């Protein structure tokens, strides 16, 4: 019974491999010979946000490119005004460990998650004048690794028990569940149209999920180690992943395989966060060796380097209008690069 | 109007700064412990006497201690343990004695010690179930270890009264198996502090305290380039 199923699975894998090799007509690094180089991108530090006591673990820009949420391990969640460097809100968390934080598209809600297995959604309206827990969600059995707001009432979450969830905030119940991974699920990224999303796990595979249907469509296995970062290309039809193997990879949703690999022989450190720019020509990757490399996303050459941090870069965010790039590291500082 | 907003947000900034300057003192005063142990080993008795994560908050000699018990997690530690590179000490609890659980404990301690993000944290080590070792001398360690026979009891480690010398030899052998791992790398950044404990004991809390101070003292002596 097991032999006829395992051999069938091997046959189907070989069929998919042969379909991919059949559709491999050429590479991205061949049709991009006559493209102008991006030159030397020399970015400068314009601000330095200094309020956190412990290491900063995750951050998220707001949709107005004005406010950003930063989450530390000291139990504080701080909302920064990026222009004037004034702290607008400081929220004390019930647990000490935080792994994710998200700022809602409308600016009304802030969600945070950590080892506590409970995703806390805070209402920033506060007609009383003080922040308050709107609703805490407790339906996971591992640890909450990443969460993202689809809209005001729906939030997608990633857990460390190999499953992803979709919540309804008003009821507090799980609308559906996503069960396809065989390892810890590290991070996820939402498409611009909020129709599909990707999930990267610790089995070196990335799963493309349909939010409304509840099934996965595609499985991308181009990596050698655990995938930490995952970010959609600005048109929603490609995405880049950052693994511990020290290589970045660019995948496609229609060619159903990798287009290009970003690697350099002098880099043996893991990747902790990636994010594309507004146009998509630059790909920013935060590495474990205390700096962020600015890769040319169509030539696989380093446009530049952001060597401002003194400890492991943990999170990286690009504004919705591309005006600035904010990076957060374990030295408890937020550098806003021009 | 443009000045009122830039006054209101200045006052909001000052209030948040005062709150973080009253919380920084608390965060800097309280010490943090990670109570990491195997399931077979009795860390439940330890949490009693001494969701996803559990927390114990206590104080000894006007010193605050948060101790964190990893609760309902997954067996894959390589990701969430990277949240713990800022605790002041990892308390590691193992039960001396089915599989070879001691070897699994050795491998876990080795992975903790060699880990890149856990090279600057010290480990406090409890060897539990010291009574069952005494009760096993008349009825396993030799079978799973080919080096137990070619081993003598330390000339420089004194044995407590009323202990069968075979049991002291087994104790010090088990200790030295963790010590060879901790002295192997020898970077000179962190130290391993082994202890003994019964299934029911009360000195444990005093022990941890008398080692956490030592860790803090060694940290200051690293700053002045003396050790």
């Amino acid at each position, epitope marked *: 019974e097991l032999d006829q199923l395992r051999q069938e699975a091997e046959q189907l894998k070989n069929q998919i491999r042969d379909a991919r090799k059949a559709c491999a007509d050429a590479t991205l690094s061949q049709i991009t010979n006559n493209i102008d180089p991006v030159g030397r991108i020399q970015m400068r530090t314009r601000r330095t946000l200094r309020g956190h006591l412990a290491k900063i673990y995750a951050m998220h820009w707001g949709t107005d490119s004005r406010l950003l949420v930063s989450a530390s391990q000291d139990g504080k969640l701080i909302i920064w005004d990026s222009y004037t460097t004034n702290k607008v809100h400081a929220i004390p968390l019930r647990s000490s460990w935080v792994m994710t934080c998200a700022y809602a598209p409308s600016g009304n809600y802030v969600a945070c998650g950590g080892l506590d297995n409970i995703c806390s959604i805070y209402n920033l309206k506060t007609r009383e004048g003080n922040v308050r827990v709107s609703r805490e969600l407790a339906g996971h059995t591992g640890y909450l690794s990443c969460c993202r707001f689809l809209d005001d009432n729906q939030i997608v979450t990633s857990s460390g028990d190999t499953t992803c969830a979709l919540w309804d905030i008003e009821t507090g119940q799980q609308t559906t569940t996503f069960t396809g991974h065989t390892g810890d699920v590290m991070s996820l990224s939402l498409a611009p149209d909020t129709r599909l999303f990707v999930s990267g796990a610790c089995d070196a595979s990335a799963k493309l999920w349909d939010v409304r249907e509840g099934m996965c469509r595609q499985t991308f296995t181009g990596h050698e180690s655990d995938i930490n970062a995952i970010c959609f290309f600005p048109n929603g039809n490609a995405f880049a992943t950052g693994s511990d193997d020290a290589t970045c990879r660019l995948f496609d949703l229609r060619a159903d395989q990798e287009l290009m690999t970003y690697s350099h022989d002098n880099i043996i450190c893991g990747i902790t966060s990636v994010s594309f720019s507004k146009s998509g020509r630059l790909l920013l990757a935060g590495y474990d060796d205390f700096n962020c490399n600015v890769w040319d996303a169509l030539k696989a050459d380093r446009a530049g380097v952001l060597a401002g941090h003194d400890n492991r870069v943990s999170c990286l965010g690009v504004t919705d209008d591309g005006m600035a790039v904010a990076t957060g590291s374990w030295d408890s500082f937020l550098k806003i690069w021009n | 109007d443009q000045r009122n907003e830039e006054k209101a947000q200045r006052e909001a900034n000052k209030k948040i700064e005062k709150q973080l300057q009253k919380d920084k003192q608390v965060y800097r005063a309280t010490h943090r412990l990670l109570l990491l142990g195997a399931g077979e080993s009795g860390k439940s008795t330890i949490v009693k006497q001494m969701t996803g994560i559990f927390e114990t908050k206590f104080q000894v000699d006007k010193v605050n201690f948060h101790m964190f018990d990893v609760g309902g997690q997954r067996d*894959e530690r390589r990701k969430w343990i990277q949240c713990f590179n800022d605790v002041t000490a990892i308390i590691f609890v193992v039960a001396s004695s*089915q*599989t070879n659980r001691l070897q699994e404990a050795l491998n876990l301690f080795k*992975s903790i010690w060699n880990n890149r993000w856990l090279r600057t944290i010290s480990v406090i080590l409890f060897l539990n179930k010291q009574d069952l070792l005494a009760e096993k001398v008349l009825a396993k360690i030799e079978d799973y270890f080919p080096e137990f026979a070619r081993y003598t009891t330390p000339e420089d480690a004194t044995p407590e009264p009323g202990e069968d010398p075979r049991v002291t030899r087994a104790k010090y052998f088990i200790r030295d198996e963790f010590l060879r791992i901790s002295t192997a790398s020898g970077d000179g950044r962190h130290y391993c502090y082994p202890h003994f404990t019964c299934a029911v004991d009360t000195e444990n809390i005093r022990r941890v305290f008398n080692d956490c101070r030592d860790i803090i003292q060694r940290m200051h002596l690293r700053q002045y380039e003396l050790l």
Partner: nanobody
Amino acid sequence: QVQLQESGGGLVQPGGSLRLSCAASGFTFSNYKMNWVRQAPGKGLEWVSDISQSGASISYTGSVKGRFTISRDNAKNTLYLQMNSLKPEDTAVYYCARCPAPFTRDCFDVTSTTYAYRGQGTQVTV
């Protein structure tokens, strides 16, 4: 795609000798520390032995120390295990396991909960 394919095994008599192989396909084999894990019938996963990247540093579990010989071949991309003086207590399913990260010293690969980086296994019975 990281894939590991164990080779060798079978029913053997005690006091004999047997070799195993691990075909490592889809990754840079030279940069990963690797090891052997076994599952005794009705028992949990227990660590047997390991080998570093270069092959200099080798360690064994005590109960089989001096009885097994682990060796990696970076030329042909294969992990090679020799087992002499076999014992009736050494029957198990054998797993060729890889450490998750490159260029490191620590590993976390005793997890029975579907650890992704180990092969399907081979049966050794005495």
